């Protein structure tokens, strides 16, 4: 049971090794648009938080799950930020989420005061007062119920079928990362020019014993002019200086 679009889930993904090769055994995926990353290189990167949102939508609105879009899904049901670096996955589920005789359990909000902020979730059911007069909880003329149920008969065109959507959104940067792909570690060598990767930091240089002190909250002190100069192993906590 995916949740309906006005009240979407949000699974926070904690520490793991994340094989994305899976997620490639579910269907043809009517879509699959990775935005900040390219999907062929996901199994070799470290991310800090991977937020997975999940909902259902009609088929002609799958193009509205994108950064900076308009229409009655992206304005006020689910707003992606313009600083987006995730991946939008969407596949048809007319064989599961739609029954004969109307499926009145998928609803979308069509009237609101104004738009949402990015990643904003509302579960309000207060009657939007369009007209100048109050109608005090009794809908009708110039004040309507805000959550309208979808249709999802099976005999609807593609473009009115229930499409399930999972939006992955994850940021890679400060802090550790916690969750990273399967890269298979490797023996650490010292005093040799090598090609190194320290939990996401890709570079070249000679590794040497340092004399700097990162405090348990520090992961890699760059130098003046903003270039990485020291790192701390990802499973030993040894501080090592780097130099071209």
């Amino acid at each position, epitope marked *: 049971r995916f949740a309906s679009v006005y009240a979407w889930n949000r699974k926070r993904i904690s520490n793991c090794v994340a094989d994305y090769s899976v997620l490639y055994n579910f269907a043809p995926f009517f879509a699959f648009k990775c935005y900040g990353v390219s999907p062929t290189k996901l199994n070799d990167l470290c991310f800090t938080n991977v937020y997975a949102d999940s909902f259902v939508i009609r088929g002609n609105e799958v193009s509205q799950i994108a950064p900076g879009q308009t229409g009655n899904i992206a304005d006020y049901n689910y707003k992606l930020p313009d600083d987006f670096t995730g991946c939008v996955i969407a596949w048809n589920s*007319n*064989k599961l989420d739609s*029954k*004969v*005789g*109307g499926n009145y359990n998928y609803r979308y909000r069509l009237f609101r005061k104004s738009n949402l902020k990015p990643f904003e979730r509302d579960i309000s059911t207060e009657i939007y007062q369009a007209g100048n007069k109050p109608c005090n909880g009794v809908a009708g003329v110039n004040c309507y119920f805000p959550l309208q149920s979808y249709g999802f*008969r*099976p*005999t*609807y*065109g*593609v*473009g009115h*079928q229930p499409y399930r959507v999972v939006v992955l959104s994850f940021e890679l940067l400060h802090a550790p990362a916690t969750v990273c792909g399967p890269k298979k570690s490797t023996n650490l060598v010292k005093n040799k020019c090598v090609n190194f990767n320290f939990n996401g930091l890709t570079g070249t240089g000679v590794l040497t014993e340092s004399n700097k002190k990162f405090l348990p909250f520090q992961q890699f002190g760059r130098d003046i002019a903003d270039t990485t100069d020291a790192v701390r192993d990802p499973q030993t906590l040894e501080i090592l200086d780097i130099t071209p």
Partner: antibody, heavy 120, light 111 residues
Framework: QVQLVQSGAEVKKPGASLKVSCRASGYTFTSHFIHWVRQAPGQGLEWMGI???????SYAQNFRDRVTMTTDPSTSTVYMELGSLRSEDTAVYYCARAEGSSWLGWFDPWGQGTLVTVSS | SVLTQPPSASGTPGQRVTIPCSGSSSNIGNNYVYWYQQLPGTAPKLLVYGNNQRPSGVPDRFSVSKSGTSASLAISGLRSEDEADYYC?????????????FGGGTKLTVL
């Protein structure tokens, strides 16, 4: 031993309505959705509707706005009502039973067939 | 009518006749096919379904084939009961509508 029986029909003037029955027997009534299919003589077949035998229904969109269905899961019958008939709707209608789950499935029991016609 | 079937076919008892039905990705390239036999003056029955399975009450001399966006039915050794109309069935999801679409059928007989 499992059969879907109907009512014999007659000439009907155009613009009128037509309620036709489909009585199910021999098995569990609320276990199998019902297909309604139609065939004009000297032509192919085209299906009208699909019915939850205790629930709702859905329709083929080429034949929307003129067909209604009703379940009646006490004397084990479903019904098809077609109003504003025309002269090109002279055909024979079969009432088939489907597989126990949703729309995709085989159509194992079939109706005897009903003749629908218009004349003067 | 979106499906494509030959309008007629003929043969002799002892010959292998194939009846095809080719459609599209919406029609066939994404949803099993089913084969129904209409004998004149009766209701249709089952012949073959699911591209590998056959129901009861039928000799398995009838066979099913599927090549991409096409399917067909094969009959070796005709008899006098095989002068009938044959239809193939498939679900389809189209832009204008969706539903349970049929073939045109093929009338098969022996002179």
């Amino acid at each position: 031993q499992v059969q879907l029986v109907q009512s014999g029909a007659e000439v009907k003037k155009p613009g009128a309505s037509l309620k036709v029955s489909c009585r199910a027997s021999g098995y569990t009534f609320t276990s199998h959705f019902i297909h309604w299919v139609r065939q004009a003589p000297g032509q192919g077949l085209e299906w009208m509707g699909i019915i939850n035998p205790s629930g709702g229904a859905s329709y083929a969109q080429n034949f929307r706005d003129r067909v209604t269905m009703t379940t009646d899961p006490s004397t084990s019958t479903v019904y098809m009502e077609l109003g504003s008939l025309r002269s090109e709707d002279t055909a024979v209608y079969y009432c088939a039973r489907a597989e126990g789950s949703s729309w995709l499935g085989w159509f194992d029991p079939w109706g005897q067939g009903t003749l629908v016609t218009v004349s003067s | 009518s979106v499906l494509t079937q030959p309008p007629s076919a003929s043969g002799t008892p002892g010959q292998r006749v194939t009846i095809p039905c080719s459609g599209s990705s919406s029609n066939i390239g994404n949803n099993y096919v089913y084969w129904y036999q209409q004998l004149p003056g009766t209701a249709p029955k089952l012949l073959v379904y699911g591209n590998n399975q056959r129901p009861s009450g039928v000799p398995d001399r009838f066979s099913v084939s599927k090549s991409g966006t096409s399917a067909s039915l094969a009959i070796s050794g005709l008899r006098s009961e095989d002068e009938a109309d044959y239809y193939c069935a498939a679900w389809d999801d189209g832009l204008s509508g969706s539903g349970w679409v049929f073939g045109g059928g093929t009338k098969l007989t022996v002179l």
